[PDB]
């Protein structure tokens, strides 16, 4: 029994963002715990531009075509 009205959330995710019934962000705002700070730094999962940790001079984000890798101790998803 499938009604397009209510798509399964775990199936909708498998579909391309544009292909989904409601076009939606395929990416989430993340929050990382800084190595040199105890305060979360809201970041984008697919961010590319170097993001510097507060105070720490170097960017904590190593970019890639998809989800940016992180170097210093980080947090997973929004916090």
């Amino acid at each position: 029994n499938v009604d397009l009205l209510y798509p399964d959330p775990v199936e909708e995710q498998r579909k391309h963002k544009l292909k989904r019934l409601v076009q939606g962000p395929n990416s989430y705002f993340l929050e990382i715990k800084c190595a040199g700070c105890q305060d979360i730094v809201v970041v984008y999962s697919h961010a590319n531009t170097p993001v510097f940790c507060p105070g720490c001079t170097s960017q904590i984000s190593i970019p890639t075509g998809g989800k940016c890798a992180f170097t210093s101790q980080v947090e997973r998803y929004r916090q």
Binding site: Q23, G24, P25, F29, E31, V43, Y44, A47, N48, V51
Partner: protein, 150 residues
């Protein structure tokens, strides 16, 4: 599809349905506008501004926090780029091709790509002039191109 190419591709960005300001937000609309204004004061393409706002800060979409576009924000304060960022970035691309062509006399392929980029500057100019964003006198010409980009 793809204008001067034959490729068909969809790598667009899908906007959020809720036009919601960030719950995780430390930025007032006045704070957001000032940062866009100050990035422009330093001097940056609008596409770069939205990348700084999204990466260094958390403003996913400027429209969500303040109900305006990024160029609309820069026209209001008055730091509007006189030649639009899309035309300016294609004019720059053309000038680069011509300089390469100067060393490579027989690069027939580069000459073909140049006609494409020229046409996409010409088509975009005719639109911007009709919208009146660009002055009626504005014309893309090879000699003036170098100086218009500077």
């Amino acid at each position: 599809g793809r204008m001067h190419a034959p490729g068909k591709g969809i790598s667009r960005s899908a906007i959020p349905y809720t036009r919601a300001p960030a719950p995780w937000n430390k930025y007032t609309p006045e704070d957001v506008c000032e940062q866009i204004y100050k990035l422009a004061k330093k001097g940056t393409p609008p596409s770069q501004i939205g990348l700084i706002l999204r990466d260094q800060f958390a403003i996913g979409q400027v429209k969500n926090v303040t109900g305006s576009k990024i160029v609309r924000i820069l026209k209001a304060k008055g730091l509007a780029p006189e030649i639009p960022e899309d035309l300016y970035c294609m004019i720059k691309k053309a000038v680069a091709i011509r300089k390469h062509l100067e060393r490579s006399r027989r690069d027939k392929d580069s000459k073909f790509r140049l006609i494409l980029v020229e046409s996409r500057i010409h088509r975009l100019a005719r639109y911007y002039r009709q919208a009146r964003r660009l002055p009626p006198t504005f014309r893309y010409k090879s000699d003036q191109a170098a100086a218009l980009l500077a």
